[PDB]
Subunit: 353 residues, 4 copies
């Protein structure tokens, strides 16, 4: 019985070692955040428009000016290989088959180059900055291998306090490795190559990355640039002012700050203030959750755990199935609310509860 | 112990095969909708008017200008024969004995003509449009056999995602059949009678039925016409503008869109805007639920599952009992709030919580 | 461990036959009302006034111009004899020992005259009108035996639908009797004494008692007259306009209309509009509940089930204990919020939640 | 697994006799207060400021003009010796090692002089007034032994009704004693020394202590004076007007009045009205709770049960661990919301829910 995302979560929990399942499902501290991420969707209900011809529906939509099959993306998640062999590739291929982008994590198990060589879909690269020089290296690598979009994640200045991991003494799977940091020269002495080597032997990332640093990154990357991890219209607006082509409102799936607001709380305001693409993630599980965000102005929704449940439970085919169910779910929802064209969604279909 | 609707639900669950009970009780996806349909009634409480002579009470009321025993109706529900033998007839006869209308579903187990021949009560016909020509045939049949009112259901452009049915692989009971589609010619070739035959061998209904199509139906039917499945004052108003004599606010008992608002949320507004009869259903189980809707301006309330529990548990007699309990419940409620005449109900007896 | 009202409820449930306990504790239909009666008190929290000398506190207060030990009363409850032998007397004597009034129910087990003869405390009489002539007889009897106050209960035009009683086929205890209806002549023929005899062989009360009837009662009774069962400032105000000396806001302990508002919802408004004594009951269990009502303007609070738990569990001594605990509870509360004199309570000590 | 305060509570419950655990964890009456103290923190969520350099963070802050390691203090709690041998000293030494103040209770197990002799940290003295003369004696003793700050607790005019203690017949541990009342002369006759001896053989404190009495105390103590137990901006303001250098908003950890508001409800208003230091306690368990209070204007947060769990579970080392976890928790939180300097916190980082 695999009829929705929750069904895949259940199957994933039965197939994954507890330690890995907890790494995946876990949230920060009391996990009031992940619960809030789900509960906030109940703050809106639908007011369908009847007697509208919905015999011909379209989920096609432009994301950052580029057309794709539906307003969805498989977001960046680390250590996918711990969930399923060659997890990064399975996700990328399923996204490509579905006609949507796949975002590779800086902490992926498959390197930037290897994926680009084995997948011709729309590949995006999510960047974490531990060392400036090293970050510049990955950015150029992504540029040279055909990655269309760069995503800077800004909500991991310090590691989230995930107590499930602490209880399990969670250690990065042995058979896995942070491939993108491979080959990064060693044996060299002096300032960097010592200053740098120190930074990469640390589990902490660059907590000094500020607005000025964003300008630096903006000049380095020539294509579309998005800033991920924002939770205020003000920050979203500043990002646009600094050169970003759009933003991704997100609280990292409730894994960083348990009491952070849900990005849904500032979605409408961010859309109204920035006037630029506002993407979003965190808590999306049902097609209705997605449609509510799109109706509030979201350009697209990125999936985190939803597609990972498919991956963990049934590999690549599992991801295909979750995307198929979600697409049919979105389609069914559009028909029921009387909005045949997904690009016609507006707050007029919602009722604040 | 059969003292209320819930008691009949309990007895129905014990007598019906799980698969059938789930078909009856089930809702869309997470079933947050059916729960909301019940919970929303708690948003209003009563403020009784004391020292009012309620020794003589009346539940009599005009629905669409025609007087009936009480502001209730047994709404249209498909496959009643799966709940109890000749279920459609049992319901119709119980409604007639109670002095209220019965609405026959397009997907009933007893044909339009057979029921009209065996029941002389006020019979209404609920229409689903799968094929225009076929729909026209049923409409004329209902007209020629004495059906007083036509009800167009507009909230099933596509089938609701009811996961209980998916889990049970629910298949339309063998001993049952969609009688109203019987005799519908076959063996014929060319456009329709091939184009048509295709549409009826499909579980999908006409998702293109729009406002223009409603005008078509309006000219075809000479008597009272109601549009069912509306969830906004705006749609209700447009229906009246297009010729409808009234509307039925409804979310199909939470069986189509899990996150749809409860029709109770737009009842007062629809009454104020349309100035025409506004009937309603979805979630009604207690007499207090019904009185609250009537106090907000509802012309009448249609029962869905409430009377079906009586049917499934004890057949025709079961329906009679549920209607008797509900009538006494409404009567008792009117006495307690100090409104002896049901037609005198107003928002003045309610307190928003 | 008998440290509060709940402890006595627990002990009462262990000592009483289930049928009797259910008669006592039960509410109308779903019992959402009794729950609401309790929950509504959480809508207010205390904002204590510190550094106030509370070394000398006083709970003494005038109720209808007459001074009593504390702003409490044991309200009218029927069939007290079913809870404990000579229950009416036990309650009356405990109230008298505590320095507060006791209200005798029309449906008591001890007659109006017998109680007045065995108790010299402040006795009030609660009237139910089944037959006008008979009611007049009890009213005069109460007047001639020294009852100081008359209370007309108006919220039982028809019997509440208490399903626990229906499930238990609850029958008025055999060893008990509605003593106040004793001796009421029989064997006589013609109009009344036939018309009357019919009314008393009925479980229904006079549902026609209206404002005009209240004027009738007002001229019959020369002392303080209160109307009980009101749930709106408007009705309270009309009662005063018709001659009442005060009112008792109440929903009959959630035993008549499950969805009725809690009287706490219209307490402040009734106090402001009538400018006359506004007493109240329904849901009071803790001293804090009582203080909140008094702070909102209530003249006094009548206890229903609270003191009955003491009665059922430990007879007269049980009632004394509950009143002692409640008095100490109120006293302790006054000290903690910084209001040494109970008559100085105001909304200034409360915070709306 | 000791990763947060709750983990220490769990370990403390396993090591402490039930009677003692209940004395510690218990609240007044229904304990709705302690629950509210926790729940109220969910009324605010965080809105992080991204791309802020948080590589260098500081928790250092001035409390009453004096710099300390972080905006925390170990508040005054009685009978610490019942939780762990020499509990008062263990707490004081852990606070000193952490760089924060420790407040000694009037009802401590270690005397004012003994502690000051064995601990050179910042020691504060919390005063309870049972007898004026005796209180004056302790105040001068605290002054002569080096206590920097005096804290008057005003919310125990009468003892809270803690039913857990009543159920357990809780008796002050035998091996323990209210040391600060030791030596207090006896054998003397006449007025005081008889009037006084009577007051100290009583479990009740001076319920007459008012504003005038505060003026008396203000002239007696030359250093910083704080009034603890306030629950309104008005009282806080009056305290400042009467000479206090600051206040401590508090409901005594929900141990005195079950329905008292949480001090968090009047924090912002008290800060705005008084313009003086507003400290606070009651319900703090997570670093996020603390940061929310600081963001609303609180000068510092006092810990009650949080550090006592560390004490009860693992003595002095346990307190050190809880303070270490809380410091790292606060630090981590500051980094995640983008406020590197704790003194820069403002309501701008919060979202009202
Ligand atoms: C197992 C796991 C690993 C993650 N790794 C990363 C990462 O490497 N880079 C990043 O930008 N976000 C990362 N995220 C956050 C996701 O991009 C996304 O914001 C989040 O999962 C959205 O919420 P949801 O899980 O409810 O869909 C991770 C989330 C999970 C559940
Ligand atoms: C078993 C079942 C079958 C239904 N079949 C139909 C149908 O054939 N036509 C229609 O207009 N509505 C149909 N409905 C919806 C009802 O008319 C009605 O809107 C709904 O049951 C009201 O909610 P309630 O069940 O809470 O009373 C059906 C509902 C149930 C429970
Ligand atoms: C067992 C029982 C019998 C009652 N009988 C009467 C009655 O004879 N007359 C009347 O005026 N109210 C009657 N009441 C209502 C009470 O006067 C009072 O309004 C109610 O109990 C208040 O609520 P509480 O039970 O939460 O305190 C009765 C209530 C109970 C619980
Ligand atoms: C076991 C225990 C004993 C206490 N003793 C005292 C005391 O002697 N003096 C005082 O001012 N407050 C006293 N308090 C109240 C604390 O100072 C503080 O207000 C309260 O614990 C804060 O709430 P929290 O426990 O949720 O942190 C006590 C609290 C507890 C839990």
């Amino acid at each position: 019985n695999l009829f929705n995302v929750e069904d895949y979560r259940k199957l994933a929990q039965k197939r994954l070692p507890k330690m890995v399942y907890d790494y995946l499902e876990g949230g920060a501290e009391d996990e009031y955040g992940v619960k809030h991420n789900r509960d906030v969707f109940q703050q809106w209900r639908f007011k369908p428009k009847r007697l509208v011809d919905v015999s011909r529906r379209s989920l096609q939509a432009e994301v950052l000016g580029k057309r794709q099959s539906m307003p969805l993306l498989i977001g960046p998640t680390a250590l996918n290989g711990a969930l399923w062999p060659k997890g990064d590739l399975a996700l990328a291929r399923a996204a490509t088959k579905a006609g949507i982008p796949f975002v590779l994590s800086t902490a992926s198990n498959m390197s930037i180059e290897d994926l680009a060589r084995q997948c011709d879909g729309d590949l995006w690269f999510q960047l974490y900055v531990i060392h400036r020089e090293i970050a510049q290296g990955m950015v150029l690598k992504a540029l040279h291998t055909g990655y269309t979009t760069l995503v800077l994640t800004t909500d991991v200045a310090v590691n989230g306090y995930r107590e499930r991991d602490l209880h399990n003494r969670f250690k990065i799977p042995p058979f896995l490795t942070l491939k993108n940091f491979e080959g990064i020269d060693l044996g060299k002495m002096d300032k960097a190559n010592l200053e740098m080597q120190a930074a990469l032997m640390s589990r902490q990332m660059d907590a000094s990355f500020n607005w000025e640093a964003l300008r630096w990154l903006r000049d380095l990357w020539p294509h579309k640039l998005l800033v991920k991890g924002l939770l205020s219209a003000e920050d979203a607006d500043r990002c646009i002012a600094e050169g970003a082509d759009g933003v991704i409102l997100s609280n990292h799936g409730g894994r960083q700050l348990d009491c952070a607001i849900s990005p849904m709380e500032v979605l409408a305001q961010s859309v109204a203030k920035t006037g630029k693409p506002v993407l979003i993630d965190s808590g999306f599980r049902r097609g209705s959750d997605i449609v509510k965000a799109l109706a509030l102005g979201a350009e697209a929704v990125l999936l985190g755990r939803a597609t990972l449940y498919g991956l963990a439970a049934r590999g690549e085919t599992g991801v295909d199935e979750v995307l198929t169910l979600l697409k049919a779910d979105i389609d069914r929802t559009l028909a029921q609310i009387g909005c045949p064209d997904i690009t016609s969604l507006s707050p007029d279909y919602l009722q604040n509860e």
